[PDB]
């Protein structure tokens, strides 16, 4: 399960966030894209060894993060942990983080279903007052 962190977070700050990835496949996962929630702006990345980072502006108006591993990915048994600064939006709002997690073999788990659903998007409660 990927999860951004923190859970909860100021409307209007600059937060440093965290996105942990775990291994679920006895497959080394190659590669990580996280959509950025609604009205959340990403500003930057912070380096890290065996990964090049890159981001897509897109048709619609959504940003999404890539992070291509480029060394072995992450095997069984591990996670990483990958961490970057975005704007919050203005206004509360449950933002939701898409992630889309690449293994060896090609596969695509999706990590962007709602609250039942089998690989559910971590979420960071956007509050203030």
Do not use: D, K, Q
């Given at each position: 399960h990927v999860s951004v962190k923190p859970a909860e977070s100021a409307?209007?700050?600059?937060?440093?966030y965290t996105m942990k990835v775990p291994s679920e496949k006895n497959?080394?996962?190659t590669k990580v894209v996280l959509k950025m929630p609604k009205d959340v702006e990403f500003q930057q990345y912070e380096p890290i060894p065996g990964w090049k980072v890159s981001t897509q502006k897109h048709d619609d108006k959504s940003v999404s993060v890539?992070?291509?591993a480029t060394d072995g990915g992450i095997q069984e048994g591990q996670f990483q942990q990958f961490t970057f600064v975005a704007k919050n939006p203005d206004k509360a709002e449950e933002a939701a983080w898409d992630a889309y997690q690449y293994y060896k073999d090609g596969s695509i788990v999706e990590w962007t279903g709602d609250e039942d659903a089998d690989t559910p998007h971590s979420i960071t409660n956007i509050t203030s007052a």
């Open positions: 409307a209007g700050s600059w937060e440093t497959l080394p996962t890539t992070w291509e």
